[PDB]
Design an enzyme around this catalytic site. Structure first.
Site, PDB file in Angstrom:
ATOM      1  N   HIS A   1      69.361 115.958  40.866  1.00 54.72           N
ATOM      2  CA  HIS A   1      68.256 115.917  42.008  1.00 54.72           C
ATOM      3  C   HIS A   1      68.660 116.885  42.798  1.00 54.72           C
ATOM      4  O   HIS A   1      69.710 117.765  42.844  1.00 54.72           O
ATOM      5  CB  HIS A   1      68.580 114.686  42.830  1.00 54.72           C
ATOM      6  CG  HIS A   1      68.418 113.375  42.166  1.00 54.72           C
ATOM      7  ND1 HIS A   1      69.412 112.776  41.242  1.00 54.72           N
ATOM      8  CD2 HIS A   1      67.284 112.655  42.292  1.00 54.72           C
ATOM      9  CE1 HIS A   1      68.898 111.575  41.049  1.00 54.72           C
ATOM     10  NE2 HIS A   1      67.682 111.581  41.418  1.00 54.72           N
TER      11      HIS A   1
ATOM     12  N   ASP B   1      82.788 138.651  33.032  1.00 57.11           N
ATOM     13  CA  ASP B   1      81.577 139.603  33.036  1.00 57.11           C
ATOM     14  C   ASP B   1      82.169 140.810  33.579  1.00 57.11           C
ATOM     15  O   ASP B   1      81.915 141.947  33.265  1.00 57.11           O
ATOM     16  CB  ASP B   1      80.172 139.144  33.680  1.00 57.11           C
ATOM     17  CG  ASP B   1      79.462 140.325  33.835  1.00 57.11           C
ATOM     18  OD1 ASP B   1      78.767 140.803  32.828  1.00 57.11           O
ATOM     19  OD2 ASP B   1      79.241 140.847  35.044  1.00 57.11           O
TER      20      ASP B   1
END
Lengths: 141, 140, 142, 140, 139, 144
Positions: free
Chosen positions: F65, F114
Site C-alpha cells: 500500500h 554498484d
C-alpha cells in the site's frame, strides 16, 4: 498541441552540455554546510546524487523530451560566500543534444540543496526572505 | 542523510506560492503567443509538466516526505522578454509544501525551455540569451 | 519473461493506434469553448499520452525499454465524443505497438479525468461515459 | 490546467468498480486457458500490472490527486471471445477513485494484449481482430 | 558522485546471472505450493516484480547507466526451507548488466517476503525466521 | 492477486529496523575509508539511495500500500570485511513498515556494490568475493 519530434533522420554524434546554477543562502547556512553540521545529511553529496538521478529522469519530467542513452553525468557543487554554485556535465552519442538533462540535473541539485537547509533559511514567520535559486543557464553545448 | 521525524507534529494548513522566470528572445515570445511553436502549446504543456512535477517531488528530492496534496496550480504569463511561472500548492500535513511548489515551477520552466530549444539557439548551437532567472518562495 | 530480442535486426518500427471516448454533448461543448475547469482537455490529454508512451516499459511487465524517435498523439473532437490517434516510431529490435496503445489509453483516461464533473449524473455515476475501442489500425511490417 | 482543491471535502468511503474487455482470437484464449503463452501467466501478470497501475494513476494522469489507496483488486475472467477485466478500488479520502479503477483496468488489458501479441497478429503483422472495447465505471 | 564515462568502451553481448535466497517457515512453503496465500500467486507476482525491477535499476541506483535491456528472466524455485531466485539479464552495450540482474533478484525476494508476511511473523510480531540471504553473481 | 483492505485496521505507530550486509574485499574497504572510490562518496550515495528507495517500495512491491512515511534513516558502518547497513522506518498508519525498511536496506546495499564494482571484479569480470549476505528485520513495533 504536443509532439516529440522525429530524429530518425539526424546523425549520431557526440553531444555535450555544461549547465551552471546558483542558490543564494544565508552566511550561517553556508557555515553549517561547510562544517557539515546539517542534521539532514551531507548537503553537497546528497544534492549531487539527486542531480545525477534527475538527469536520467529528464524524459519523464519533460513531455517532449526523447529518452536518451546517457554516457556521462557529473554534478559539481562549489561553496561560495553568498551561496552554492552547481555545475552539471552530461554527454552521450545520440541524434539529439543533452542540454535538458544537464539543465534538469542542475535544477534538481539546487532544489535538493534548498530542501537540506530549510530550517536554517526560514525566518520566524516560516518564510524565505534571502533564499533564491538564481540564473540557471547553459555554459556550453 | 535522513528524512526527519514529523510524527510529533500537528496536521495544519500548508500553503506555498513560488515564482520563477525564464528569459527568452522576443522572436521566441511572439511565436509562443501566436502559438506558432512546432512542439505544441508551450504554456499548457508546461503547466502540465509542472503539476505532474509537484507530485514527483518526493522521488526527486531525497529527504522529502511523501505528502498528500490537496491543491496544485501552475500559472504562466507572458511578458515582453520572458515567461513568468507562478506555482501554488496546498495540503494539510505536519510538514510544509514549499518543495512541491519549488519543484513544480522549476519543471515548468524547464519544459518551457525544451519547447523552444530551436528558437533560442544561435548559429553555434549555443544559448547566449536563455536562462532561468529567479525561482523563489513568494509566500508560505 | 521479457523475450530475447538479442539476435533481432535494427529496423524501422512504426504503429498507429486509434481510440474513442463517448462523452455527453454538453461535455463536448465545454471542451470546444475551452470552458473545462481542470484545464485545456486536448493539450493536457496529448501531453499525458506522449509521456505515457515513454512510461510503457514501466507499466507493462514484459515490455522492453525502447529508444523512441517519434511520438505523436492526435485528438479530434466529434459531436458524440473524442477520437485519439497515436503514432510512435523507432528503429530498434522490437516493434512499438504497445507504446502506441499505452499512449492512446492514457490520453483517453486523461480526457475522462478532465471532464469527470460534467460526465457524472445526479447520482455520481457514469451512465454515458465510455472508452469504446482502442485498436492498432496500422504498423510497419517486420 | 490544475488539480482542484479538495481541502474542504469530506473524508468518506470512496469506491469504484470498472469493467473492461479485450477481444482475442480463440486460438489465443485456447493458449491462455492451457497456459501455453510463451511470455508467461497471462492472467496473474495482467492482474499484477493492473494493481501497480492503480497506484501509478496520479503519476500518469496530470490532474489526479495522490490518494491513500486502501484496497485494489483486479479480476480477470476468460470468456470464449475475449477476457473481461473488473477492477475495484477503495479508500477513505476527500476525492473519488474512479480514475484509479479505470487505469488499473486499462493497464490490465494492455498487459494482456502485450502477452499474446505474437498469437494475435495476422500474416501481414497486423492486428485485424484484437481490440480493447468498452472500459466503463460500473454501478452499484 | 558520478556516472563514469563509457563512450570509448566496446559494445558487446552483456550477460549476468544472479542467484538469491529467502528462508521461510515450512508452513509458509506449504501455503505457496498449494497456492493458499491470501495476497496471491507468490511465484508469478514475485517474478513479474523482478522483471519490472530490472528495468528500474537506473532509477534506483544513482550512478547506474540507463541500459537498453534485450532479455530479462526470473526463475523462482521452491525448496524445502525457502525459495531460490535466479535472474538473467542480457544486452549489447558498453557496460555490463550485473546491477540489473542483482536488482531483479532483490526485488523478487522482497516481493516474496511481502506476499507471506502474516505467515512468517512470530507471536511478538517479529521475523526471527525470515531472512534474505546470499544474493550473488554466479558463473 | 490483490492489495488487502486495511480500512478496519487502526491508525497506530509503525516502526521497523532492518539490518543488511555486503561482503567486500579488504582493498575495496580501504578505498571506501580513504574516499578513493572513483564513483563518489559510497556511504552518502548509498544512504541517499536507500532513503529514496524506502519511498519507492509501493512502486516496486505489487501488493504494497502507498504509505505516508514519517521517518526514514539509513545507517552505514564500515567493517573489516564489508559494510553493514541498518535502516529505520516509521509511520502512523494502518499498515506496518517492514517492507519499506527492507527495500531501503536492499537498495542501499545494491548501491554499495554498484559503487565499487571496478574494485570487486576479477580479471574475468566476475564477482567471486562480492556478496550481499543477510538482509533481515531485526526489530519492529508490535501491532494489534
Amino acid at each position: 498541441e504536443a509532439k516529440i519530434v522525429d530524429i530518425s533522420s539526424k546523425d549520431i554524434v557526440l553531444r555535450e552540455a555544461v549547465v551552471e546554477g546558483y542558490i543564494k543562502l544565508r552566511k550561517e547556512t553556508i557555515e553549517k554546510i561547510k562544517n557539515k553540521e546539517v542534521e539532514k545529511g551531507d548537503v553537497i553529496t546528497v544534492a549531487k546524487t539527486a542531480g545525477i538521478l534527475a538527469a536520467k529522469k529528464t524524459p519523464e519530467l519533460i513531455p517532449m523530451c526523447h529518452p536518451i542513452p546517457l554516457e556521462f553525468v557529473d554534478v559539481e557543487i562549489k561553496i561560495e560566500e553568498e551561496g552554492l554554485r552547481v555545475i552539471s556535465t552530461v554527454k552521450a552519442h545520440y541524434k539529439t543534444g543533452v542540454e535538458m538533462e544537464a539543465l534538469t540535473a542542475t535544477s534538481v541539485a539546487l532544489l535538493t540543496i534548498w530542501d537540506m537547509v530549510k530550517k536554517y533559511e526560514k525566518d520566524e514567520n516560516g518564510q524565505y526572505p534571502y533564499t533564491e535559486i538564481k540564473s540557471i543557464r547553459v555554459i556550453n553545448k
